[PDB]
Design an enzyme around this catalytic site. Structure first.
Site, PDB file in Angstrom:
ATOM      1  N   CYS A 104      -2.896  -9.973  13.261  1.00 20.31           N
ATOM      2  CA  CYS A 104      -2.833  -8.392  13.060  1.00 20.31           C
ATOM      3  C   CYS A 104      -4.148  -7.886  12.213  1.00 20.31           C
ATOM      4  CB  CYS A 104      -1.446  -8.177  12.290  1.00 20.31           C
ATOM      5  SG  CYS A 104      -1.310  -6.286  12.770  1.00 20.31           S
ATOM      6  N   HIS A 124      -5.174  -6.816  15.674  1.00 17.29           N
ATOM      7  CA  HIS A 124      -4.472  -5.693  16.263  1.00 17.29           C
ATOM      8  C   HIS A 124      -5.492  -4.567  16.552  1.00 17.29           C
ATOM      9  CE1 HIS A 124      -0.908  -2.933  16.069  1.00 17.29           C
ATOM     10  NE2 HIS A 124      -1.806  -2.050  16.191  1.00 17.29           N
TER      11      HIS A 124
END
Length: 185
Positions: A104, A124
């Site tokens: 992420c 991400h």
């Protein structure tokens, strides 16, 4: 028996921290959940509170880890990016030639600590710009990207693939598959 070090700072994404810890432990690898700020419980991005196994302070002393994993979560990743302890660990892990995994927003920590510049990586979608500032990495959109000792994933819904990749990297295809089956993925 493989050992994994997981650094948990507040603001860290719960799902992204628990899924890999759970998974890796299912694979028989000793996982140490070290609280970046100490041994006190950590409040994650969505308010779930996790009690660390130990503080980075102590964990750091427990020799090397076959893998050090950085969870996501905007704030969590910011805390890591600003931590000197994390900087020394990442750097040691990169000299010692060990595995570093970040999912992420977590990989933006490798950037702050100048870890693995030149590696192909993913993040991400909303963390791409931060991670690519200065063009020190080559961006990828695969759910899991692995360039040597740098393993990155994109988000919550890639955690399982992220975690299983670590397992494969550490214990091989066979173990990862065995662990995977019962998960009902």
């Amino acid at each position: 028996s493989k050992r994994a070090l997981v650094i948990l700072a507040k603001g860290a994404e719960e799902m992204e921290t628990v899924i890999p810890v759970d998974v890796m432990r299912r694979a028989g690898i000793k996982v140490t959940v070290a609280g970046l700020a100490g041994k006190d419980p950590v409040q994650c991005s969505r308010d779930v509170v996790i009690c660390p196994d130990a503080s980075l302070e102590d964990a750091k002393k427990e020799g090397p880890y076959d893998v050090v994993v950085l969870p996501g979560g905007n704030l969590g990743a910011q805390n890591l990016s600003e931590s000197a302890a994390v900087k020394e660990i990442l750097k040691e892990q990169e000299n010692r030639k060990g595995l570093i995994a970040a999912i992420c927003a977590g990989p933006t920590a490798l950037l702050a600590h100048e870890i693995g510049c030149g590696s192909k990586v993913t993040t991400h979608p909303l963390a791409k710009d931060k991670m690519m500032n200065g063009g020190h990495y080559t961006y990828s959109e695969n759910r899991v990207e692995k360039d040597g000792l740098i393993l990155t994933s994109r988000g919550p819904g890639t955690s399982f693939e992220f975690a299983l990749a670590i397992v494969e990297a550490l214990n091989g295809k066979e173990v990862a598959a065995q662990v995977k089956a019962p998960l009902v993925l």
